[PDB]
Structure formats: C-alpha cells, structure tokens
Design an enzyme around this catalytic site. Structure first.
Site, PDB file in Angstrom:
ATOM      1  N   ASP A 148     -14.955   8.270  90.913  1.00  0.00           N
ATOM      2  CA  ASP A 148     -13.994   9.049  91.450  1.00  0.00           C
ATOM      3  C   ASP A 148     -13.507   8.801  92.758  1.00  0.00           C
ATOM      4  O   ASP A 148     -13.653   9.937  93.719  1.00  0.00           O
ATOM      5  CB  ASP A 148     -14.390  10.621  91.089  1.00  0.00           C
ATOM      6  CG  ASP A 148     -13.277  11.412  91.186  1.00  0.00           C
ATOM      7  OD1 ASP A 148     -12.176  11.174  91.036  1.00  0.00           O
ATOM      8  OD2 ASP A 148     -13.704  12.691  91.173  1.00  0.00           O
ATOM      9  N   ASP A 175     -20.511  13.410  81.217  1.00  0.00           N
ATOM     10  CA  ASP A 175     -20.097  13.947  79.754  1.00  0.00           C
ATOM     11  C   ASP A 175     -19.825  15.314  79.994  1.00  0.00           C
ATOM     12  O   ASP A 175     -18.808  15.429  79.419  1.00  0.00           O
ATOM     13  CB  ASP A 175     -21.377  13.686  79.113  1.00  0.00           C
ATOM     14  CG  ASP A 175     -21.743  12.417  78.418  1.00  0.00           C
ATOM     15  OD1 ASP A 175     -20.950  12.222  77.806  1.00  0.00           O
ATOM     16  OD2 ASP A 175     -22.861  11.999  78.515  1.00  0.00           O
TER      17      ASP A 175
END
Ligand SMILES: Nc1ncnc2c1ncn2[C@@H]1O[C@H](COP(=O)(O)OP(=O)(O)NP(=O)(O)O)[C@@H](O)[C@H]1O
Ligand SMILES: Nc1ncnc2c1ncn2[C@@H]1O[C@H](COP(=O)(O)OP(=O)(O)NP(=O)(O)O)[C@@H](O)[C@H]1O
Ligand SMILES: Cn1cnc2c(F)c(Nc3ccc(Br)cc3F)c(C(=O)NOCCO)cc21
Ligand SMILES: [Mg+2]
Ligand SMILES: [Mg+2]
Lengths: 311, 274
Positions: A148, A175
C-alpha cells in the site's frame, strides 16, 4: 550513519519505558486524521509521558481472526529503520484494534501535498530516496512487502525524516480489509488488479503514481486535460479499467528534468517485469543526482505547513 | 411532513458506521436507531427529494421490514428507524459463528425473500442488500433494514443525483460495479445481492475468500472475470437451493429471476424436505 544511529537507538530507549499497553493509560489530545478503515489520534501515554499516535481500526471479525491479527502485528517490534515509522505496540479493547506508533509532526505527504499544491522535484528527489530505502529494508530484512504505497502512508516530521508506514505485515488483516467499502481512487498496479503481487516491483508502480500525483498536485488518472496542464468525476471501476487497458501516466513536457521524467516512466511500466526494481532505481540518474543535492527538507516542510523554521 | 425537532430524540451510545451514516442507539418513545447521515449540508433540491423518499418509506409495513419512523434535520440530517435487539446476519454467520440447523438457514432465506418481495411490490430498490442489513429479531423473525434512500447515498452537485457508488463491494452486481449501463441499480441488482447472501448461508463464508484486494475484486467482478466459487457450498445443502443461488448470480442481469419466482422456489423446497 551517525545521526541516524543516534535517533534509532534513542527510540529503543524510550520504547523500553513503555510496558503493557492498556487503554486506560492514554489521554486523548487531538485528532490527526481519518481514512476509510481507521481513525488516528495524537495521545499521551501517562505511565511513560511519551506522546504517540494511536490508530484505531474498527473491524467486525470473529475473535479467532482478530487474535491472530494482534499476534501478527507484533512483528512490528522488529522493524527498526530510519525509513520505517516507529512502532510502540498493538492491542485490542473496546471492539477496536489499536496500533501505537511514533508521532510524525509533519503528517503524511497527502496532507502536506494539499498545503503545498505541488511538491518541487528537488524535494520529491529526497522522498524517492527514502521510499526506495524503505521498501528495501522491508524486502531484505523481513521478506515482507508494503502492498500500500501512496502519499497517505509516507510520513514526515520536523527533523526532516521521511518514513513509511501502514505496510502489510499482518496476513490476516489483509484478508480482513478486503471486505471494505469502495474507495474513490486506487494506487494498485495493473498486475495486482488482475492477478497477484509481483514482488517489490508492484510497490514501485505505486511509488511512481504517487510521485506523479505529488509532482503535479492532482490524482493523475485520467492524465490532465490539454489546458488543465498549461494551468500549471470518474467512476472507480473506470479508473481500474483505465489502469489496466490504457497507457500509464507521465510527467509534463518541460516542467521537470529529463532524469526525473524518465525515473517515473521506468516506475510506471505496465509489465511488472519490464518495470524497474529497487536496485535499478537505486542507481538511476535522478536518484544519483537528488542524493548529491543538499536540499533543506525540514525547513521546506515547516515553511509549507506554516510553522516557523526549526533547528 | 414527517420531520422531528431536535429536542425529541435522546441520542445515545455510538454504535458504528456504514456506507452512508453512523448509527447511535437513541430514545424516541422507546429505543430507536439514529443514523447520522454522511451528507451533512444537503441541497434544497436534494432535501425535497429526500423528503419525497421518506414519504414512500413511511408507508412501508411488513413483518420482515425494519419500520421507518421518519427523519430529523435539526442538528444534522438523520434517520430514525426501529431498533433491533440481537445481532445481524453478518454477525451470526461471520463473527459469532452461530450453528443454525439447515432447516433454519432455509427459513432465514425464506423470510428474506418474503421481505424483498414486498419492497419490490411497492417498487422499492434496496440498493444495499447484504447480511449486515438483515437482523434476526428475538432469534426468530428476519428484518431487513437500510433499504432505499438513493438520494442520501449518492451525494449531489445541485440538481444532479449521480451514484458515485458506495457500499460493500461483495454484494454488488457487476452492472452496478461498472456504473455505466444507465440506471445500474434495479430489481435484479438486489436479486444478485440476495444471491450473495445465499452464498453466505450455504457456505458459512463470504465470497472471494482467496482474494484479498479490494480493487482486484472490483475490476474482476465488474469485468465479468470473477464469480463466487460455488464449490464452497456445504455438503448438506439442497441441490434445489444451490441451483437457485446460481440463477440470482447470473452475470447478465436480465437472466436473473425476480422475487415472486424466487420466494416460490424456496417454499417449494422448504415443504418437501424433512
Ligand atoms: N503516526 C502518525 N503520525 C501522524 N499522522 C498520522 C500518523 N498515522 C496516520 N496519520 C495521519 O492521519 C490519517 C490516518 O489515516 P489512515 O488510517 O492511514 O488512512 P489513509 O491512509 O489517510 N487513507 P486509507 O488508507 O484509505 O484509510 C492520515 O491522513 C495521515 O496523514
Ligand atoms: N436499526 C438498527 N438497530 C440496531 N443496530 C443497527 C441498526 N442499523 C444498524 N445497526 C448496527 O450499527 C452498526 C452500523 O450500521 P450501518 O451504518 O448500517 O453499517 P452497515 O449496515 O454495516 N453498512 P450499510 O448499512 O450499507 O451502511 C452495525 O453494527 C449494525 O449492525
Ligand atoms: C492490510 N494490512 C496488513 N498488515 C497491516 C498493518 F500492519 C497496518 N498498520 C500499520 C503497519 C505498520 C505501521 Br509502522 C503502522 C501501522 F498502523 C495496516 C493499516 O494501518 N492500514 O490502514 C488502513 C486504514 O486504517 C494494514 C495492514
Ligand atoms: Mg495510512
Ligand atoms: Mg445495517
């Protein structure tokens, strides 16, 4: 070097003064920011007097998963680099995960970009150094990858430091995050939008897109108009389709050096393998040059925010 | 004029935030749910469409539909709806991991279609059907909330409501995802969401369990490359049911059934079972 070794060792010092992290040991000072996943506060740890930032993620997950998340986040006690935000401890209480990290009084470059409108290439030069070094420390010393990179996750302080944070160290939190509401814009490289993370290369795309966005002051997808550029609302699905099916963005014609324009072009190659890797960027012309320059980053920042000159 | 002055509502503990508001447990002749909408300052052109929608939502009454009680514009714009005891379907399936008998699973599906069938009968598109918006009152009856409200879910510019698209992505039909094919939200887009909910009930899992990238789902589901893995349907599930789930999930919306037929299918396999 020497000033970094001083600072790194000084952190571990203040870190030992913090023990178990309980929710009653914190007094809320001010809000620092919020995203679509968490909210961050400037806070004072009463037992130790330190001042930290405390991100609070509120997930609705089953407790088995949540307890593995907290457990996985404790790898962050091993990240000790001048290019990685300091980590004080993670825990769970009142239905939220807390990650306690060092306070970066400059903010994220996403905020600093709004206060600056654009960022000068000479600055971005030093920024690229730090991001490249930071992804490196993550790829070698821990064999984990950021996943990210975007201006919101590069943090900067009044001592002129530039640190990465909010990198994917917790497999179960990745997840868990994937049941989020839709965002307004993506920094996801085109392979990840069709397949999976292609090692450090796919962090590098995002770095490039973040460089362009900051160099010009505007989300670069779709690239600026013909006269919006001389002035120097797309659907989220179309942006993702534009990133996969359209030529990547590029810097403006004459405003930036050629070495810088090539650097981001090597970062935004749509094929992750033809794209440049860390060792390639590490010895690029634009990095070789921006490393030699004695840019005053700390002062440029305090100026830009409106704080008086430091040191 | 279904409004509510400031001093009437006793706003209480902050519960949580969703795709278009933050909910608090309030008081208003009993416990209510106060959702402080996100669009803070609305348009006088927006505000009249929101009032118009409240009119349609006040005239809704069904055993499987959370009662809409009206709104309040006083401190900030807000929605007051029935408060529900106990947990949402999302909590039961994915957090508490409640062990329902398969007969009750099918009954949760039946009452939900039952309730959707009423909203469609009154020409109401949910736009946000997901197990988070299905509660189980007294661990018995199903109750659907957060229906309609198109005007405050898609912030305006002045006289143009354009869904910038929000919500949880797992229940969005592809045509919704793309946001191109005119009005993307439709009865079948709800049927698609309903299908994803079936997938929840039949598998005890959320879809795309092996994809952990928000934008990767958005692109692949929207490009027709990604589809819920129906393998994951547990072994003790009716064949007649699994085939119903697949009809709701058709990538092209026109192939999906409407709720009259859907509810039909579930009752048929409900009877003929034990
Ligand atoms: N340690 C920190 N010190 C100072 N500011 C911080 C710190 N951590 C986060 N912030 C700021 O506060 C906000 C925290 O938001 P964050 O949860 O990281 O979401 P985001 O990165 O802005 N966007 P998103 O990833 O979509 O949730 C950001 O705008 C940062 O600028
Ligand atoms: N009427 C209600 N009564 C009781 N709890 C509620 C009610 N509505 C929502 N909640 C709960 O309040 C929290 C936030 O709800 P909400 O703002 O609806 O988010 P969401 O339903 O997950 N997504 P969305 O409904 O599409 O915005 C969740 O824990 C819900 O389960
Ligand atoms: C998906 N994923 C996997 N591991 C993760 C992690 F360790 C995170 N935190 C995090 C990491 C390093 C530092 Br130093 C400080 C932090 F706070 C975050 C996160 O904070 N994402 O931001 C979302 C908006 O709240 C996300 C993770
Ligand atoms: Mg962040
Ligand atoms: Mg809800």
């Amino acid at each position: 070097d020497e000033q970094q070794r001083k600072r790194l060792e000084a952190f571990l010092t203040q870190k030992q003064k913090v023990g178990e992290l309980k929710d009653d040991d914190f007094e809320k000072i001010s809000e620092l920011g919020a995203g679509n996943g968490g909210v961050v506060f400037k806070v004072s740890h009463k037992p130790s007097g330190l001042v930290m930032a405390r991100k609070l993620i509120h997930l609705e997950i089953k407790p088995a998963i949540r307890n593995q998340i907290i457990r996985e986040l404790q790898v962050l006690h091993e990240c000790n680099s001048p290019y990685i935000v300091g980590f004080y401890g993670a825990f769970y209480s009142d239905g939220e995960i807390s990650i306690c990290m060092e306070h970066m009084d400059g903010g994220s470059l996403d905020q600093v970009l709004k206060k600056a409108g654009r960022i000068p290439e000479q600055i971005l030069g030093k920024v690229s150094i730090a991001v490249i070094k930071g992804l490196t420390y993550l790829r070698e010393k821990h064999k984990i990858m950021h996943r990210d990179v975007k201006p919101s996750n590069i943090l900067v302080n009044s001592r002129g430091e530039i640190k990465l944070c909010d990198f994917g160290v917790s497999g179960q939190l990745i997840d868990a995050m994937a049941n989020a509401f839709v965002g307004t814009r993506s920094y996801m490289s085109p392979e990840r939008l069709q397949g999976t993370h292609y090692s450090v290369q796919s962090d590098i795309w995002s770095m490039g897109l973040s460089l362009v966005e900051m160099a010009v002051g505007r989300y670069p997808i779709p690239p600026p108009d013909a006269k919006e550029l001389e002035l120097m609302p797309m659907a989220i699905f179309e942006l993702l389709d534009y990133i996969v099916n359209e030529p990547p963005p590029k810097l403006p014609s004459g405003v930036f050096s050629l070495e810088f324009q090539d650097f981001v072009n090597k970062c935004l190659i749509k094929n992750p393998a033809e794209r440049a890797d860390l060792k390639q960027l590490m010895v690029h012309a634009f990095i070789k040059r921006s490393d030699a320059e004695e840019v005053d980053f700390a002062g440029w920042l305090c100026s830009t925010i409106g704080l008086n000159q430091p040191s | 004029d279904w409004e509510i002055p400031d001093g009437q509502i006793t706003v209480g503990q902050r519960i949580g935030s969703g795709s278009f508001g933050t909910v608090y447990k309030g008081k208003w002749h009993g416990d209510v749910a106060v959702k402080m909408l996100n669009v803070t300052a609305p348009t006088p052109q927006q505000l009249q469409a929101f009032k118009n929608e409240v009119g349609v939502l006040r005239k809704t009454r069904h055993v499987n539909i959370l009662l809409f009680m009206g709104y309040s514009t006083k401190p900030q714009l807000a929605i007051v709806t029935q408060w529900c005891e106990g947990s949402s379907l999302y909590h039961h399936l994915h957090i508490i991991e409640t062990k329902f008998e398969m007969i009750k699973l099918i009954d949760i599906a039946r009452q939900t279609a039952q309730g959707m069938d009423y909203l469609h009968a009154k020409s109401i598109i949910h736009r946000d059907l997901k197990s988070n918006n299905i509660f189980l009152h007294e661990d018995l009856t199903v109750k659907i909330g957060d229906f309609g409200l198109a005007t405050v879910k898609s912030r305006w510019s002045g006289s143009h409501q354009f869904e910038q698209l929000s919500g949880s992505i797992l229940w969005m039909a592809p045509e919704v995802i793309r946001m191109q094919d005119k009005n993307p939200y439709s009865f079948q887009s709800d049927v698609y969401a309903f299908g994803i909910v079936l997938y929840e009930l039949m598998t005890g899992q959320l879809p795309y369990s092996n994809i952990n990238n928000r934008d990767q789902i958005i692109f692949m589901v929207g490009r027709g490359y990604l589809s819920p893995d129906l393998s994951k349907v547990r072994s003790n599930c009716p064949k007649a049911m699994k085939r119903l789930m697949a009809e709701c999930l058709k990538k092209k919306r026109d192939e999906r059934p409407l709720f009259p037929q859907i509810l039909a299918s579930i009752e048929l396999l409900a009877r003929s079972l034990p």
